[PDB]
Design a protein around this nucleic acid. Structure first.
Lengths: 73, 51, 150, 178, 41, 88
RNA sequence: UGAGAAAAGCCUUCUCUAGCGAUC
Protein backbone atom coordinates (compact mmCIF):
# COMPACT_ATOMS: atom_id res chain seq x y z
CA UNK A 1 0.00 0.00 0.00
CA UNK A 2 2.79 2.43 0.89
CA UNK A 3 4.76 1.67 -2.30
CA UNK A 4 2.60 -0.24 -4.80
CA UNK A 5 2.31 1.87 -7.94
CA UNK A 6 1.37 0.91 -11.48
CA UNK A 7 4.69 2.42 -12.57
CA UNK A 8 6.22 -0.45 -10.59
CA UNK A 9 4.07 -2.83 -12.64
CA UNK A 10 5.00 -1.15 -15.95
CA UNK A 11 8.72 -0.52 -15.52
CA UNK A 12 9.54 3.02 -16.65
CA UNK A 13 12.27 4.06 -14.18
CA UNK A 14 15.26 2.41 -12.53
CA UNK A 15 14.18 3.37 -8.99
CA UNK A 16 11.09 4.88 -7.38
CA UNK A 17 10.54 7.89 -5.15
CA UNK A 18 11.51 7.15 -1.55
CA UNK A 19 9.55 8.69 1.34
CA UNK A 20 11.78 8.87 4.40
CA UNK A 21 9.14 7.67 6.86
CA UNK A 22 7.82 4.11 6.56
CA UNK A 23 4.76 2.32 7.93
CA UNK A 24 6.90 0.00 10.06
CA UNK A 25 8.72 2.98 11.61
CA UNK A 26 5.31 4.35 12.61
CA UNK A 27 2.79 2.37 14.62
CA UNK A 28 1.21 1.05 11.43
CA UNK A 29 -2.21 1.25 9.84
CA UNK A 30 -5.28 0.96 12.06
CA UNK A 31 -7.14 -1.41 9.70
CA UNK A 32 -6.44 -4.63 7.81
CA UNK A 33 -7.12 -5.11 4.10
CA UNK A 34 -6.36 -8.84 3.70
CA UNK A 35 -6.94 -12.24 5.29
CA UNK A 36 -4.71 -4.29 17.23
CA UNK A 37 -2.02 -2.12 18.82
CA UNK A 38 -4.52 0.25 20.47
CA UNK A 39 -6.31 -2.72 22.08
CA UNK A 40 -3.20 -3.86 23.99
CA UNK A 41 -2.62 -0.29 25.16
CA UNK A 42 -6.20 0.01 26.42
CA UNK A 43 -5.80 -3.38 28.11
CA UNK A 44 -2.43 -2.38 29.60
CA UNK A 45 -3.65 1.00 30.86
CA UNK A 46 -6.69 -0.69 32.40
CA UNK A 47 -4.40 -3.28 34.02
CA UNK A 48 -2.33 -0.57 35.71
CA UNK A 49 -5.50 0.79 37.37
CA UNK A 50 -6.29 -2.27 39.47
CA UNK A 51 -6.93 -2.71 43.19
CA UNK A 52 -4.40 -5.55 43.25
CA UNK A 53 -1.06 -3.71 43.39
CA UNK A 54 2.50 -4.27 44.61
CA UNK A 55 2.48 -4.67 48.42
CA UNK A 56 -1.07 -6.07 48.23
CA UNK A 57 0.10 -8.93 50.45
CA UNK A 58 1.83 -6.38 52.68
CA UNK A 59 -1.36 -4.60 53.72
CA UNK A 60 -2.99 -6.06 56.81
CA UNK A 61 -6.63 -5.19 56.04
CA UNK A 62 -8.15 -5.26 52.55
CA UNK A 63 -9.83 -1.97 51.57
CA UNK A 64 -13.62 -2.43 51.54
CA UNK A 65 -15.10 -3.74 48.30
CA UNK A 66 -17.90 -1.17 48.06
CA UNK A 67 -19.09 1.86 50.00
CA UNK A 68 -22.45 3.58 50.17
CA UNK A 69 -22.57 7.10 48.76
CA UNK A 70 -23.53 8.54 52.16
CA UNK A 71 -20.38 7.15 53.81
CA UNK A 72 -18.16 8.43 50.99
CA UNK A 73 -19.69 11.91 51.24
CA UNK B 1 9.24 27.16 12.85
CA UNK B 2 11.28 28.83 15.61
CA UNK B 3 11.12 31.57 18.22
CA UNK B 4 13.17 33.95 16.06
CA UNK B 5 10.69 33.42 13.20
CA UNK B 6 7.82 34.16 15.60
CA UNK B 7 9.47 37.37 16.81
CA UNK B 8 9.89 38.64 13.24
CA UNK B 9 6.20 38.04 12.49
CA UNK B 10 5.16 39.73 15.74
CA UNK B 11 7.00 42.91 14.73
CA UNK B 12 5.48 42.88 11.23
CA UNK B 13 1.94 42.46 12.59
CA UNK B 14 2.43 45.37 15.00
CA UNK B 15 3.75 47.65 12.25
CA UNK B 16 0.92 46.56 9.95
CA UNK B 17 3.16 45.32 7.13
CA UNK B 18 2.73 41.95 5.42
CA UNK B 19 5.45 39.45 6.24
CA UNK B 20 6.63 36.96 3.62
CA UNK B 21 5.23 34.07 5.68
CA UNK B 22 1.79 35.70 5.78
CA UNK B 23 1.65 36.16 2.00
CA UNK B 24 2.82 32.56 1.52
CA UNK B 25 -0.20 31.26 3.44
CA UNK B 26 -2.64 33.69 1.81
CA UNK B 27 -1.59 33.01 -1.79
CA UNK B 28 -1.57 29.22 -1.39
CA UNK B 29 -5.00 28.46 0.09
CA UNK B 30 -7.18 31.33 -1.14
CA UNK B 31 -9.00 30.97 -4.48
CA UNK B 32 -8.65 33.83 -6.94
CA UNK B 33 -14.54 38.17 -5.24
CA UNK B 34 -13.00 37.04 -1.94
CA UNK B 35 -13.91 38.57 1.43
CA UNK B 36 -11.07 38.56 3.97
CA UNK B 37 -11.54 39.47 7.63
CA UNK B 38 -8.70 41.13 9.52
CA UNK B 39 -8.50 42.74 12.94
CA UNK B 40 -6.30 45.68 11.91
CA UNK B 41 -7.34 48.25 9.27
CA UNK B 42 -3.69 48.88 8.41
CA UNK B 43 -2.90 45.24 7.59
CA UNK B 44 -6.12 45.05 5.57
CA UNK B 45 -5.06 47.89 3.27
CA UNK B 46 -1.58 46.38 2.87
CA UNK B 47 -2.99 42.99 1.82
CA UNK B 48 -5.38 44.66 -0.63
CA UNK B 49 -2.41 46.44 -2.25
CA UNK B 50 -0.29 43.28 -2.56
CA UNK B 51 -3.18 40.95 -3.47
CA UNK C 1 -30.37 9.03 20.47
CA UNK C 2 -31.81 6.23 18.40
CA UNK C 3 -33.46 8.60 15.92
CA UNK C 4 -30.18 9.26 14.07
CA UNK C 5 -29.24 5.57 14.32
CA UNK C 6 -32.72 4.68 13.02
CA UNK C 7 -32.24 7.06 10.08
CA UNK C 8 -28.93 5.39 9.26
CA UNK C 9 -30.35 1.86 9.51
CA UNK C 10 -33.28 2.77 7.24
CA UNK C 11 -30.69 4.22 4.86
CA UNK C 12 -28.80 0.90 5.03
CA UNK C 13 -31.97 -1.15 4.42
CA UNK C 14 -32.31 -0.77 0.59
CA UNK C 15 -28.92 -2.26 -0.26
CA UNK C 16 -29.59 -5.13 2.15
CA UNK C 17 -32.93 -5.88 0.48
CA UNK C 18 -31.28 -5.67 -2.94
CA UNK C 19 -28.65 -8.15 -1.72
CA UNK C 20 -31.50 -10.43 -0.64
CA UNK C 21 -32.86 -10.03 -4.18
CA UNK C 22 -29.49 -11.12 -5.58
CA UNK C 23 -29.40 -14.40 -3.69
CA UNK C 24 -25.95 -13.40 -2.46
CA UNK C 25 -27.16 -13.30 1.15
CA UNK C 26 -29.83 -15.17 3.06
CA UNK C 27 -32.50 -13.64 5.28
CA UNK C 28 -30.81 -14.72 8.53
CA UNK C 29 -27.56 -13.23 7.24
CA UNK C 30 -29.41 -9.95 6.59
CA UNK C 31 -30.78 -10.07 10.14
CA UNK C 32 -27.30 -10.61 11.59
CA UNK C 33 -25.89 -7.78 9.46
CA UNK C 34 -28.66 -5.46 10.68
CA UNK C 35 -28.01 -6.43 14.32
CA UNK C 36 -24.25 -5.90 14.14
CA UNK C 37 -24.65 -2.67 12.15
CA UNK C 38 -27.00 -1.31 14.82
CA UNK C 39 -24.57 -2.38 17.56
CA UNK C 40 -21.68 -0.59 15.84
CA UNK C 41 -23.85 2.45 15.07
CA UNK C 42 -24.84 2.90 18.72
CA UNK C 43 -21.19 3.35 19.73
CA UNK C 44 -20.35 6.25 17.39
CA UNK C 45 -23.48 8.33 18.11
CA UNK C 46 -22.79 8.74 21.84
CA UNK C 47 -21.89 11.93 23.69
CA UNK C 48 -18.51 10.42 24.63
CA UNK C 49 -16.59 9.39 21.51
CA UNK C 50 -13.51 7.22 21.01
CA UNK C 51 -11.44 6.62 17.88
CA UNK C 52 -11.49 2.82 18.12
CA UNK C 53 -15.26 2.76 17.59
CA UNK C 54 -14.82 4.60 14.28
CA UNK C 55 -11.99 2.22 13.36
CA UNK C 56 -14.19 -0.80 14.11
CA UNK C 57 -17.05 0.65 12.05
CA UNK C 58 -14.74 1.22 9.08
CA UNK C 59 -13.21 -2.26 9.41
CA UNK C 60 -16.63 -3.93 9.56
CA UNK C 61 -17.79 -2.16 6.40
CA UNK C 62 -14.53 -3.07 4.65
CA UNK C 63 -14.98 -6.73 5.64
CA UNK C 64 -18.56 -6.68 4.35
CA UNK C 65 -17.39 -5.18 1.05
CA UNK C 66 -14.72 -7.89 0.71
CA UNK C 67 -17.26 -10.64 1.44
CA UNK C 68 -19.64 -9.24 -1.19
CA UNK C 69 -16.77 -9.02 -3.69
CA UNK C 70 -15.78 -12.65 -3.09
CA UNK C 71 -19.35 -13.91 -3.40
CA UNK C 72 -20.17 -11.96 -6.60
CA UNK C 73 -17.39 -13.75 -8.51
CA UNK C 74 -18.71 -17.17 -7.49
CA UNK C 75 -22.29 -16.25 -8.38
CA UNK C 76 -21.26 -14.39 -11.53
CA UNK C 77 -23.61 -11.47 -10.82
CA UNK C 78 -22.01 -8.14 -11.73
CA UNK C 79 -25.14 -5.97 -11.95
CA UNK C 80 -26.29 -3.38 -9.39
CA UNK C 81 -22.82 -2.29 -8.29
CA UNK C 82 -24.02 1.28 -7.78
CA UNK C 83 -26.98 0.36 -5.56
CA UNK C 84 -24.83 -1.40 -2.95
CA UNK C 85 -21.09 -0.79 -3.27
CA UNK C 86 -21.27 2.95 -3.92
CA UNK C 87 -23.69 3.43 -1.01
CA UNK C 88 -21.37 1.55 1.36
CA UNK C 89 -18.35 3.51 0.09
CA UNK C 90 -20.22 6.80 0.58
CA UNK C 91 -21.12 5.83 4.15
CA UNK C 92 -17.49 4.90 4.88
CA UNK C 93 -16.33 8.22 3.40
CA UNK C 94 -18.75 10.06 5.69
CA UNK C 95 -17.42 8.14 8.69
CA UNK C 96 -13.83 8.97 7.69
CA UNK C 97 -14.70 12.65 7.23
CA UNK C 98 -16.28 12.84 10.69
CA UNK C 99 -13.33 11.01 12.27
CA UNK C 100 -10.77 13.26 10.55
CA UNK C 101 -12.70 16.38 11.58
CA UNK C 102 -12.76 15.18 15.19
CA UNK C 103 -9.05 14.22 15.28
CA UNK C 104 -7.02 16.39 12.91
CA UNK C 105 -3.59 15.80 14.46
CA UNK C 106 -3.57 12.01 13.93
CA UNK C 107 -1.50 11.34 10.81
CA UNK C 108 -2.23 7.60 10.90
CA UNK C 109 -5.97 8.19 10.46
CA UNK C 110 -5.21 10.47 7.50
CA UNK C 111 -3.02 7.79 5.91
CA UNK C 112 -5.71 5.14 6.44
CA UNK C 113 -8.20 7.49 4.77
CA UNK C 114 -5.79 7.91 1.85
CA UNK C 115 -5.35 4.14 1.55
CA UNK C 116 -9.11 3.53 1.51
CA UNK C 117 -9.57 6.29 -1.07
CA UNK C 118 -6.91 4.65 -3.25
CA UNK C 119 -8.51 1.23 -2.98
CA UNK C 120 -12.24 2.02 -3.24
CA UNK C 121 -12.83 5.68 -4.12
CA UNK C 122 -12.82 7.93 -7.17
CA UNK C 123 -9.55 9.72 -7.95
CA UNK C 124 -11.14 13.14 -7.38
CA UNK C 125 -12.16 12.12 -3.85
CA UNK C 126 -8.54 11.15 -3.19
CA UNK C 127 -7.51 14.50 -4.69
CA UNK C 128 -9.70 16.31 -2.16
CA UNK C 129 -8.15 14.27 0.68
CA UNK C 130 -4.59 15.41 -0.09
CA UNK C 131 -5.64 19.07 -0.10
CA UNK C 132 -7.21 18.63 3.34
CA UNK C 133 -4.02 16.89 4.51
CA UNK C 134 -1.58 19.50 3.21
CA UNK C 135 -3.70 22.42 4.45
CA UNK C 136 -3.11 21.63 8.14
CA UNK C 137 0.01 19.43 7.88
CA UNK C 138 2.17 21.57 5.60
CA UNK C 139 5.13 21.40 8.02
CA UNK C 140 5.87 17.75 7.17
CA UNK C 141 8.00 17.39 4.00
CA UNK C 142 7.20 13.67 3.70
CA UNK C 143 3.50 14.39 3.09
CA UNK C 144 4.42 16.69 0.19
CA UNK C 145 6.47 13.88 -1.38
CA UNK C 146 3.61 11.38 -1.06
CA UNK C 147 1.18 13.73 -2.81
CA UNK C 148 3.69 14.39 -5.60
CA UNK C 149 4.48 10.67 -5.89
CA UNK C 150 0.83 9.78 -6.47
CA UNK D 1 -42.51 -9.98 56.33
CA UNK D 2 -44.14 -13.34 55.58
CA UNK D 3 -44.63 -12.06 52.04
CA UNK D 4 -41.07 -10.71 52.26
CA UNK D 5 -39.73 -14.09 53.41
CA UNK D 6 -41.60 -15.83 50.59
CA UNK D 7 -40.24 -13.34 48.04
CA UNK D 8 -36.65 -13.55 49.28
CA UNK D 9 -36.86 -17.35 49.27
CA UNK D 10 -38.27 -17.22 45.72
CA UNK D 11 -35.26 -15.19 44.54
CA UNK D 12 -33.04 -16.81 41.92
CA UNK D 13 -29.77 -15.84 40.20
CA UNK D 14 -31.55 -15.73 36.83
CA UNK D 15 -33.83 -12.87 37.93
CA UNK D 16 -31.04 -10.80 39.51
CA UNK D 17 -31.39 -7.02 39.37
CA UNK D 18 -27.82 -6.42 38.17
CA UNK D 19 -28.68 -8.33 34.99
CA UNK D 20 -31.07 -5.53 33.97
CA UNK D 21 -28.92 -2.51 34.88
CA UNK D 22 -25.34 -1.27 34.70
CA UNK D 23 -25.29 0.83 37.88
CA UNK D 24 -23.16 -1.85 39.57
CA UNK D 25 -20.84 -4.44 38.00
CA UNK D 26 -18.97 -7.18 39.86
CA UNK D 27 -15.26 -7.34 39.05
CA UNK D 28 -12.31 -9.15 40.61
CA UNK D 29 -9.73 -6.74 39.18
CA UNK D 30 -11.47 -3.34 39.31
CA UNK D 31 -13.67 -1.27 41.57
CA UNK D 32 -17.32 -1.28 40.39
CA UNK D 33 -17.32 2.35 39.22
CA UNK D 34 -14.48 1.69 36.76
CA UNK D 35 -15.84 -1.81 36.09
CA UNK D 36 -19.11 -0.31 34.81
CA UNK D 37 -17.18 1.50 32.04
CA UNK D 38 -15.67 -1.66 30.48
CA UNK D 39 -16.99 -2.97 27.16
CA UNK D 40 -17.38 -6.69 26.47
CA UNK D 41 -14.57 -6.48 23.90
CA UNK D 42 -12.06 -5.27 26.50
CA UNK D 43 -12.94 -8.02 28.99
CA UNK D 44 -12.78 -10.60 26.19
CA UNK D 45 -9.32 -9.30 25.24
CA UNK D 46 -8.13 -9.54 28.86
CA UNK D 47 -9.45 -13.10 29.14
CA UNK D 48 -7.84 -14.15 25.86
CA UNK D 49 -4.53 -12.59 26.90
CA UNK D 50 -4.65 -14.43 30.22
CA UNK D 51 -5.41 -17.74 28.54
CA UNK D 52 -2.63 -17.18 25.99
CA UNK D 53 -0.18 -16.53 28.83
CA UNK D 54 -1.43 -19.65 30.63
CA UNK D 55 -0.91 -21.78 27.51
CA UNK D 56 2.84 -21.15 27.67
CA UNK D 57 3.24 -22.49 31.21
CA UNK D 58 0.88 -25.44 30.75
CA UNK D 59 -0.27 -26.78 27.36
CA UNK D 60 -3.29 -28.82 28.48
CA UNK D 61 -5.42 -25.65 28.64
CA UNK D 62 -5.94 -25.64 24.84
CA UNK D 63 -9.22 -27.55 25.15
CA UNK D 64 -10.75 -24.52 26.89
CA UNK D 65 -10.13 -22.27 23.87
CA UNK D 66 -13.29 -23.33 22.05
CA UNK D 67 -16.13 -23.60 24.63
CA UNK D 68 -15.17 -20.72 26.94
CA UNK D 69 -12.76 -18.36 25.16
CA UNK D 70 -14.21 -18.05 21.65
CA UNK D 71 -16.77 -15.96 19.79
CA UNK D 72 -19.52 -18.49 20.57
CA UNK D 73 -18.86 -18.06 24.29
CA UNK D 74 -18.66 -14.29 23.75
CA UNK D 75 -22.19 -14.08 22.32
CA UNK D 76 -23.67 -16.71 24.65
CA UNK D 77 -25.68 -15.62 27.69
CA UNK D 78 -26.83 -18.31 30.10
CA UNK D 79 -30.32 -16.98 30.88
CA UNK D 80 -31.48 -17.39 27.28
CA UNK D 81 -30.67 -21.11 27.00
CA UNK D 82 -32.30 -24.11 28.65
CA UNK D 83 -31.27 -26.07 31.74
CA UNK D 84 -29.32 -28.67 29.75
CA UNK D 85 -27.11 -25.97 28.22
CA UNK D 86 -26.55 -24.51 31.69
CA UNK D 87 -25.63 -27.97 33.00
CA UNK D 88 -23.08 -28.47 30.22
CA UNK D 89 -21.71 -24.99 30.93
CA UNK D 90 -21.47 -25.93 34.61
CA UNK D 91 -19.44 -29.02 33.74
CA UNK D 92 -17.11 -27.00 31.50
CA UNK D 93 -16.65 -24.26 34.10
CA UNK D 94 -16.00 -26.80 36.87
CA UNK D 95 -13.36 -28.54 34.74
CA UNK D 96 -11.71 -25.22 33.85
CA UNK D 97 -11.68 -24.13 37.51
CA UNK D 98 -10.15 -27.47 38.52
CA UNK D 99 -7.42 -26.79 35.96
CA UNK D 100 -7.07 -23.19 37.19
CA UNK D 101 -6.71 -24.05 40.89
CA UNK D 102 -2.91 -24.75 40.83
CA UNK D 103 -2.17 -21.44 39.05
CA UNK D 104 -4.60 -19.20 40.96
CA UNK D 105 -1.84 -17.08 42.52
CA UNK D 106 -0.61 -16.07 39.05
CA UNK D 107 -1.98 -13.02 37.20
CA UNK D 108 -3.17 -14.81 33.99
CA UNK D 109 -5.44 -17.02 36.09
CA UNK D 110 -6.86 -13.85 37.66
CA UNK D 111 -7.51 -12.41 34.19
CA UNK D 112 -9.27 -15.60 33.09
CA UNK D 113 -11.34 -15.59 36.28
CA UNK D 114 -12.25 -11.95 35.65
CA UNK D 115 -13.44 -12.80 32.13
CA UNK D 116 -15.47 -15.73 33.49
CA UNK D 117 -17.10 -13.53 36.14
CA UNK D 118 -17.86 -10.82 33.58
CA UNK D 119 -19.39 -13.17 30.99
CA UNK D 120 -20.96 -16.10 32.88
CA UNK D 121 -21.56 -14.59 36.37
CA UNK D 122 -20.01 -17.59 38.10
CA UNK D 123 -20.24 -15.77 41.45
CA UNK D 124 -24.01 -16.33 41.22
CA UNK D 125 -24.28 -19.65 39.35
CA UNK D 126 -21.11 -21.54 40.42
CA UNK D 127 -20.43 -20.52 44.02
CA UNK D 128 -19.35 -24.00 45.11
CA UNK D 129 -16.89 -24.44 42.23
CA UNK D 130 -15.33 -21.02 42.86
CA UNK D 131 -14.99 -21.69 46.60
CA UNK D 132 -13.43 -25.09 45.87
CA UNK D 133 -10.98 -23.42 43.47
CA UNK D 134 -9.95 -20.65 45.87
CA UNK D 135 -10.09 -22.47 49.24
CA UNK D 136 -6.44 -23.70 49.56
CA UNK D 137 -5.29 -20.04 49.36
CA UNK D 138 -7.46 -18.73 52.20
CA UNK D 139 -4.49 -16.95 53.80
CA UNK D 140 -4.14 -14.58 50.83
CA UNK D 141 -5.83 -11.26 50.04
CA UNK D 142 -7.05 -12.23 46.57
CA UNK D 143 -9.06 -14.87 48.44
CA UNK D 144 -10.63 -11.99 50.38
CA UNK D 145 -11.51 -10.28 47.10
CA UNK D 146 -13.11 -13.45 45.71
CA UNK D 147 -15.14 -13.84 48.92
CA UNK D 148 -16.17 -10.17 48.68
CA UNK D 149 -17.56 -10.93 45.22
CA UNK D 150 -20.07 -13.40 46.70
CA UNK D 151 -23.28 -12.55 48.57
CA UNK D 152 -23.59 -14.66 51.74
CA UNK D 153 -25.57 -12.33 54.00
CA UNK D 154 -28.39 -14.76 54.84
CA UNK D 155 -27.76 -16.70 58.06
CA UNK D 156 -29.32 -19.84 56.53
CA UNK D 157 -26.89 -19.82 53.59
CA UNK D 158 -24.34 -22.61 53.26
CA UNK D 159 -21.39 -20.17 53.21
CA UNK D 160 -22.67 -17.84 55.95
CA UNK D 161 -19.71 -18.56 58.24
CA UNK D 162 -17.48 -16.81 55.68
CA UNK D 163 -19.34 -13.53 56.31
CA UNK D 164 -16.80 -11.66 58.53
CA UNK D 165 -13.87 -12.04 56.11
CA UNK D 166 -16.07 -10.24 53.57
CA UNK D 167 -17.17 -7.52 56.00
CA UNK D 168 -13.75 -6.80 57.52
CA UNK D 169 -11.45 -7.58 54.58
CA UNK D 170 -9.16 -10.01 56.42
CA UNK D 171 -7.98 -13.50 55.38
CA UNK D 172 -9.66 -16.53 56.88
CA UNK D 173 -7.92 -17.92 59.95
CA UNK D 174 -6.93 -21.57 59.92
CA UNK D 175 -8.35 -22.18 63.40
CA UNK D 176 -11.84 -21.19 62.26
CA UNK D 177 -11.42 -23.47 59.24
CA UNK D 178 -10.44 -26.38 61.51
CA UNK E 1 -46.02 -10.90 -14.79
CA UNK E 2 -46.77 -13.50 -12.11
CA UNK E 3 -44.97 -16.19 -14.12
CA UNK E 4 -42.04 -13.78 -14.46
CA UNK E 5 -41.95 -13.39 -10.67
CA UNK E 6 -42.10 -17.17 -10.23
CA UNK E 7 -39.11 -17.40 -12.57
CA UNK E 8 -37.13 -14.98 -10.37
CA UNK E 9 -38.02 -16.81 -7.15
CA UNK E 10 -36.45 -20.04 -8.43
CA UNK E 11 -33.44 -18.01 -9.58
CA UNK E 12 -32.98 -16.77 -6.01
CA UNK E 13 -33.32 -20.36 -4.80
CA UNK E 14 -30.76 -21.51 -7.38
CA UNK E 15 -28.23 -18.82 -6.40
CA UNK E 16 -28.80 -19.49 -2.69
CA UNK E 17 -28.17 -23.21 -3.21
CA UNK E 18 -24.85 -22.73 -5.02
CA UNK E 19 -23.38 -20.36 -2.41
CA UNK E 20 -23.87 -22.80 0.49
CA UNK E 21 -22.52 -26.17 -0.71
CA UNK E 22 -18.90 -25.10 -1.29
CA UNK E 23 -17.24 -22.41 0.85
CA UNK E 24 -13.49 -21.66 0.85
CA UNK E 25 -11.59 -21.34 4.11
CA UNK E 26 -11.06 -17.59 3.63
CA UNK E 27 -14.82 -17.06 3.35
CA UNK E 28 -15.54 -18.76 6.68
CA UNK E 29 -13.07 -16.37 8.33
CA UNK E 30 -14.97 -13.45 6.78
CA UNK E 31 -18.45 -14.70 7.77
CA UNK E 32 -17.54 -14.78 11.47
CA UNK E 33 -16.50 -11.12 11.25
CA UNK E 34 -19.62 -10.09 9.33
CA UNK E 35 -22.26 -12.35 10.91
CA UNK E 36 -20.78 -13.47 14.24
CA UNK E 37 -20.72 -16.93 15.78
CA UNK E 38 -24.27 -17.61 16.99
CA UNK E 39 -25.94 -21.03 17.17
CA UNK E 40 -29.70 -21.08 17.77
CA UNK E 41 -30.28 -24.85 17.61
CA UNK F 1 -39.13 23.56 -1.50
CA UNK F 2 -37.36 26.78 -2.50
CA UNK F 3 -33.82 27.54 -1.32
CA UNK F 4 -32.55 31.10 -0.94
CA UNK F 5 -30.23 32.54 -2.18
CA UNK F 6 -30.98 30.99 -5.57
CA UNK F 7 -27.35 31.14 -6.73
CA UNK F 8 -25.48 27.85 -6.32
CA UNK F 9 -22.33 27.46 -4.25
CA UNK F 10 -19.17 25.54 -5.11
CA UNK F 11 -18.11 22.54 -3.00
CA UNK F 12 -16.05 23.26 0.10
CA UNK F 13 -12.86 21.36 -0.79
CA UNK F 14 -10.98 21.98 -4.02
CA UNK F 15 -9.36 18.82 -5.47
CA UNK F 16 -5.70 19.98 -5.69
CA UNK F 17 -5.68 20.33 -9.48
CA UNK F 18 -7.84 23.45 -9.29
CA UNK F 19 -5.52 24.84 -6.60
CA UNK F 20 -2.41 24.27 -8.75
CA UNK F 21 -3.56 26.91 -11.26
CA UNK F 22 -3.61 29.76 -8.75
CA UNK F 23 0.08 29.61 -7.87
CA UNK F 24 2.62 31.82 -9.64
CA UNK F 25 6.42 32.12 -9.58
CA UNK F 26 8.53 34.28 -7.28
CA UNK F 27 11.46 32.00 -6.39
CA UNK F 28 14.49 32.14 -8.74
CA UNK F 29 14.21 28.35 -9.08
CA UNK F 30 10.68 28.71 -10.44
CA UNK F 31 11.67 31.51 -12.84
CA UNK F 32 14.24 29.45 -14.75
CA UNK F 33 11.98 26.40 -14.99
CA UNK F 34 9.10 28.67 -16.01
CA UNK F 35 11.23 30.36 -18.70
CA UNK F 36 12.69 27.17 -20.19
CA UNK F 37 9.24 25.61 -20.60
CA UNK F 38 7.61 28.51 -22.48
CA UNK F 39 10.54 29.02 -24.84
CA UNK F 40 9.85 25.40 -25.82
CA UNK F 41 6.43 23.80 -26.34
CA UNK F 42 5.77 21.96 -23.05
CA UNK F 43 2.84 23.32 -20.99
CA UNK F 44 3.09 24.30 -17.34
CA UNK F 45 -0.18 22.64 -16.26
CA UNK F 46 -2.22 19.61 -17.28
CA UNK F 47 -5.08 20.91 -19.48
CA UNK F 48 -7.63 18.18 -18.71
CA UNK F 49 -6.98 18.07 -14.96
CA UNK F 50 -6.91 21.87 -14.53
CA UNK F 51 -10.04 23.68 -15.78
CA UNK F 52 -9.88 27.23 -17.11
CA UNK F 53 -12.40 30.08 -16.73
CA UNK F 54 -15.59 29.33 -18.66
CA UNK F 55 -9.53 31.44 -32.78
CA UNK F 56 -6.75 29.37 -34.35
CA UNK F 57 -4.94 29.17 -31.00
CA UNK F 58 -8.09 27.72 -29.44
CA UNK F 59 -8.31 25.18 -32.27
CA UNK F 60 -4.73 23.96 -31.83
CA UNK F 61 -5.21 23.94 -28.05
CA UNK F 62 -8.25 21.71 -28.59
CA UNK F 63 -6.02 19.44 -30.69
CA UNK F 64 -3.53 19.40 -27.80
CA UNK F 65 -6.33 18.37 -25.43
CA UNK F 66 -7.36 15.59 -27.83
CA UNK F 67 -3.78 14.31 -27.96
CA UNK F 68 -3.40 14.51 -24.17
CA UNK F 69 -6.60 12.49 -23.80
CA UNK F 70 -5.22 10.04 -26.38
CA UNK F 71 -2.05 9.38 -24.36
CA UNK F 72 -4.06 8.72 -21.19
CA UNK F 73 -6.11 6.07 -23.00
CA UNK F 74 -2.90 4.62 -24.46
CA UNK F 75 -1.26 4.34 -21.04
CA UNK F 76 -4.42 2.80 -19.58
CA UNK F 77 -4.63 0.28 -22.43
CA UNK F 78 -0.97 -0.67 -21.96
CA UNK F 79 -1.64 -0.97 -18.22
CA UNK F 80 -4.60 -3.23 -19.01
CA UNK F 81 -2.40 -5.42 -21.23
CA UNK F 82 0.17 -6.14 -18.52
CA UNK F 83 -2.61 -6.79 -15.99
CA UNK F 84 -4.09 -9.46 -18.27
CA UNK F 85 -0.66 -11.10 -18.62
CA UNK F 86 -0.17 -11.25 -14.84
CA UNK F 87 -3.66 -12.73 -14.45
CA UNK F 88 -2.65 -15.48 -16.90
C1' U G 1 -44.55 25.87 68.33
C1' G G 2 -47.89 21.95 69.52
C1' A G 3 -47.78 14.37 63.48
C1' G G 4 -43.59 17.31 71.42
C1' A G 5 -38.33 17.78 71.35
C1' A G 6 -33.32 15.37 70.23
C1' A G 7 -29.88 11.96 67.80
C1' A G 8 -28.23 8.03 64.53
C1' G G 9 -28.41 4.10 60.22
C1' C G 10 -31.72 2.58 55.06
C1' C G 11 -34.95 3.45 50.53
C1' U G 12 -38.13 7.18 47.60
C1' U G 13 -38.75 11.74 44.97
C1' C G 14 -36.28 15.78 43.03
C1' U G 15 -32.82 20.41 42.39
C1' C G 16 -28.29 23.10 40.62
C1' U G 17 -24.13 23.83 38.03
C1' A G 18 -19.66 21.84 35.17
C1' G G 19 -17.52 19.38 31.05
C1' C G 20 -19.18 16.44 27.09
C1' G G 21 -22.43 16.02 22.16
C1' A G 22 -23.82 18.54 17.73
C1' U G 23 -17.58 19.43 12.13
C1' C G 24 -20.78 14.22 7.68
Amino acid sequence: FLNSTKAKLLKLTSSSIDPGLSIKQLGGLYINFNATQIKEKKKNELLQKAVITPDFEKNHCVPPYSESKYQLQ
Amino acid sequence: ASSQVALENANAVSEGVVHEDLRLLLETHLPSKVLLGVGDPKIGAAIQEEL
Amino acid sequence: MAEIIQERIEDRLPELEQLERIGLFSHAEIKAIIKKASDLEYKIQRRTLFKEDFINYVQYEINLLELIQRRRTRIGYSFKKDEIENSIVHRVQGVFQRASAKWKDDVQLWLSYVAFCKKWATKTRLSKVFSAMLAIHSNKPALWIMAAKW
Amino acid sequence: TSLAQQLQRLALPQSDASLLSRDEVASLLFDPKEAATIDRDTAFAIGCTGLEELLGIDPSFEQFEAPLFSQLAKTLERSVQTKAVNKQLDENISLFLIHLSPYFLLKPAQKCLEWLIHRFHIHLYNQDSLIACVLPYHETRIFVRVIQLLKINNSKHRWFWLLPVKQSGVPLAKGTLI
Amino acid sequence: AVAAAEEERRLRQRNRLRLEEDKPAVERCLEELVFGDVEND
Amino acid sequence: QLVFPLEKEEPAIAPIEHVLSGWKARTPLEQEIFNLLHKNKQPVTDPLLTPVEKLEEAKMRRAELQRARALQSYYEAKARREKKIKSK
